[PDB]
Design an enzyme around this catalytic site. Structure first.
Site, PDB file in Angstrom:
ATOM      1  N   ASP A  46      -4.316  -3.255   6.080  1.00 30.49           N
ATOM      2  CA  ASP A  46      -3.581  -3.875   4.961  1.00 30.49           C
ATOM      3  C   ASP A  46      -4.172  -5.169   4.399  1.00 30.49           C
ATOM      4  O   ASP A  46      -4.257  -6.185   5.122  1.00 30.49           O
ATOM      5  CB  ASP A  46      -2.154  -4.267   5.366  1.00 30.49           C
ATOM      6  CG  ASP A  46      -1.381  -3.163   6.059  1.00 30.49           C
ATOM      7  OD1 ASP A  46      -1.938  -2.068   6.329  1.00 30.49           O
ATOM      8  OD2 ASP A  46      -0.188  -3.423   6.396  1.00 30.49           O
ATOM      9  N   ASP A 166       6.657  -7.299   6.182  1.00 29.41           N
ATOM     10  CA  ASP A 166       5.704  -7.337   5.085  1.00 29.41           C
ATOM     11  C   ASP A 166       6.229  -8.178   3.916  1.00 29.41           C
ATOM     12  O   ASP A 166       6.308  -7.685   2.777  1.00 29.41           O
ATOM     13  CB  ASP A 166       5.369  -5.911   4.633  1.00 29.41           C
ATOM     14  CG  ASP A 166       4.834  -5.036   5.766  1.00 29.41           C
ATOM     15  OD1 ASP A 166       4.303  -5.574   6.774  1.00 29.41           O
ATOM     16  OD2 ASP A 166       4.912  -3.804   5.632  1.00 29.41           O
TER      17      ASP A 166
END
Ligand code: NA
Ligand code: NA
Ligand code: NA
Ligand code: NA
Lengths: 488, 488
Positions: A46, A166
């Site tokens: 990510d 996140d």
């Protein structure tokens, strides 16, 4: 094959010789990318903290530096003047505190009073290995030096399961917002949970963003809101998404959804599109992150790599890379994606193309191929091919009465997550022209379709001598082929 | 402060967390260079294996990755398409065998039948810590993978002391030659020792190259022969050189010597210049390496860093960097040095300059300043300066009746090896124009003088807010100032 214990051994319990060996193994791989961000060692995933700060672009990365696996995660740091020429600034956030003892998971960056706030999820595992997710706001200064707080900004609320992570932190409508990926504890459904603050110290829950009555998977990873041509655009990863909502072939999708408007205080989203759509029609894009830059553009960059998947380079002890940066545009009710202008600086050895069946007998491992193909045709374009076209990356095109693009990587080399298919299909408008802008870099291919209307991104592992580019039929087209210089 | 034991602890006895911490500390230093090669961690010194191979330029580096000291050395590897945009390929040669158990010391690269031979000195320390130098030929393949032999190519002969190292391997006159830096065992004088072979397996001694009756220091490090405009040019480091032969102010000099002709079989050198000259008139250039490239150019690159010296960044646990690549030219009986053409790709934000006293109130940390100054003038140009010009890098110029350039770094920041002087002086021709092409990058400055006739390269450590560029007097001149993008 790696055990839990091996994945969570502390970085200090690895020796430095092994890490140096791993850097050599990753960098000298015959499949390494050299004009895209790639791990220095181990696994990359990510994008994080994608931002502009202190006179340059910044990009951070989920990293596990000791092997091709999702071991205990840290952030590492890159910066660039132009979203193309990146330079390494080293590790940024380690799993070195109670709050992030089993990982510094993904997060975002927001400039604040001359500092860069890095907000991320501390993946805490308690005494029983119960996961307790903490949202942490660290701070970076103008020397790229980072300080960590001793306390979380947002404690896990009662209504969410262990999956709550996140954070996207940003300023909007005069206040601060945090968007979090969430699984509801009772329904086990995926949500984007909204938090708001006027000072960054006290956070208030506004609830799940209303994305309609239909479930958005069982978890939403990596939620993003960016404004593109003044439309609110969501970019997010709904694991378990029902394919009745939208087709997809990757194990987990990376969707986008354009709204007419959004009201974060009231948790309201008025959709422009009736349905979310795949951000990328290819084989491997995931965990895309985006932000609104001071130049007035929205930029996105993708992890090229999927969770719970494996790759032929796993035996080389490293894994994955990033897409190039994509400048976002709303056009005709859809999200368009474009290479940034600076990527043209890599081009050299330009060759003009007009109807030649064989575009190149041997194109090199790094190039950009930009083609314009007349309507009314059918055939195959072979990339990274052997001489007889039996082993290649295949773009099977029809611009006639059943127009479509099928990208087929089955013959390119060893199989790549075959349980999720060796082909991807992009429907085209019948009897229309077709533009392709194709970037090849080592074991990475990016296919921009009809000037950014679709993007298909994929890993492929061709033998180094397979570098032919050729149509199988006489095809009418014009184009350019450029080599692309190594910079990374 | 580091003990012998600490300097020779094996890399496997350091932990990986410490190495990751060190990479962050080096990369985020406020004094780091970002368009010159710099260590990823620890100390960098001598360029090695500078070459062209397998479609790109290659450059290796003496490296000690764990601190700002000359710990046990390895080679690390970079490559580039253009001698400007380098990318890291990781460690290449470790001190991991008997032959190089106390260091893989410097060496060179030569293409041979599709491989790249890396010839280097194994710094062996026997059971009693007696140094036994071995010359080793390793081999690199087209994937940048390196194999090491079990036996040395050249064993230390009786006539040399323990100082016998830094082989330059190349093909010339139909056979293979090795040039080695040597100290004669009986006289303790520095020499370039010549070896020749027709097959790379059996080596024959041709003796010391005849550099005249006067001693060339007590040791010659890093000897190089390159052909520049068809002249044989020696580039070398004669430690202990008598300053009566040539003035120099650095602790150890890096000299060059142009010959009219050279005969390696007969150990003969016919000098063009009566005396060797400083390659660099600045404060810090050492261990320069050069090679003849397939494009017909001779290229050189320098370590910016001196042995037995210290630097204000030592407390940051990293040390030194490289010069930019210099394309070599013989003109008017002297060696000229030029930035490579590709360095112009870094330029942006061009500003035209004509007689402005203040060139920039705040120039940034990375720029190129190119000036043309009329004859008949005297004054000071201040770089990396505070507002009142009391703290800066000073270029004190006179183009009138006692023409000269004095570069003074005393006020720029903390003292830098002050025992070897805070100024360097370059004589100029009276009543002549003056050109300057000045590259600033973090704590590095490179001053190209009169279109490459002289180069002055130096470290300096200015506070980050000291970025003014200004003349102290009204000066007549024209020029351009460009920012330079970070790429490293
Ligand atoms: Na714009
Ligand atoms: Na597949
Ligand atoms: Na030339
Ligand atoms: Na000094």
């Amino acid at each position: 094959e790696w055990t839990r214990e091996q994945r969570y051994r502390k970085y200090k319990d690895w020796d430095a010789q092994t890490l140096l060996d791993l850097q050599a193994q990753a960098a000298t791989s015959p499949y390494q990318m050299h004009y895209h961000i790639h791990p220095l060692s181990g696994l990359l995933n990510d994008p994080n903290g994608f931002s502009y700060y202190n006179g340059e672009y910044h990009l951070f990365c989920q990293s596990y530096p000791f092997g091709p696996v999702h071991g205990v995660k840290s952030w590492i740091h890159f910066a660039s003047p132009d979203l193309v020429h990146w330079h390494y600034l080293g590790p940024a956030i380690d799993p070195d505190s109670d709050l992030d003892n089993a990982g510094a998971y993904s997060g975002s960056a927001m400039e604040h009073n001359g500092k860069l706030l890095l907000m991320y999820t501390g993946n805490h595992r308690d005494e029983d290995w119960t996961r307790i997710p903490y949202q942490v706001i660290a701070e970076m200064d103008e020397n790229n030096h980072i300080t960590k707080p001793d306390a979380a900004a947002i404690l896990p609320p009662e209504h969410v399961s262990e999956h709550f992570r996140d954070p996207q932190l940003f300023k909007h409508d005069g206040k601060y917002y945090v968007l979090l990926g969430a699984q509801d504890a009772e329904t086990k459904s995926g949500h984007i949970d909204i938090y708001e603050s006027d000072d960054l110290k006290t956070w208030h829950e506004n609830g799940y963003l209303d994305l309609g009555k239909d479930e958005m998977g069982y978890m939403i990873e990596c939620p993003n809101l960016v404004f593109v041509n003044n439309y609110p655009v969501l970019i997010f990863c709904p694991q378990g998404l029902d394919k009745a909502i939208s087709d997809y072939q990757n194990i987990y999708p990376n969707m986008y959804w354009i709204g007419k408007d959004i009201n974060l205080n009231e948790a309201k989203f008025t959709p422009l599109q009736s349905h979310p759509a795949n951000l990328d029609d290819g084989f491997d894009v995931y965990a895309t992150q985006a932000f609104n830059a001071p130049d007035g553009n929205a930029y996105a960059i993708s992890w090229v790599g999927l969770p719970d998947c494996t790759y032929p380079t796993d035996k080389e002890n490293w894994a994955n890379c990033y897409s190039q940066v994509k400048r976002l545009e709303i056009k005709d009710g859809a999200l368009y994606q474009h290479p940034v202008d600076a990527i043209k600086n890599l081009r050299h050895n330009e060759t003009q193309l007009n109807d030649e069946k064989i575009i190149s007998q041997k194109a090199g491992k790094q190039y950009e191929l930009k083609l314009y193909l007349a309507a009314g045709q059918a055939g195959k374009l072979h990339l990274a091919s052997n001489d007889d076209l039996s082993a290649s990356l295949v773009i099977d095109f029809n611009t006639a009465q059943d127009a479509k693009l099928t990208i087929d990587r089955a013959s390119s080399g060893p199989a790549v997550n075959p349980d999720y298919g060796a082909t991807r299909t992009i429907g085209l408008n019948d009897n229309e022209d077709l533009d392709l802008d194709i970037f090849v870099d080592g074991s990475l291919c990016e296919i921009f379709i009809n000037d950014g209307r679709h993007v298909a991104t994929l890993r492929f592992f061709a033998r180094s001598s397979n570098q032919k580019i050729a149509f199988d039929k006489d095809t009418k087209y014009t184009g350019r082929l450029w080599s692309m210089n190594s910079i990374l």
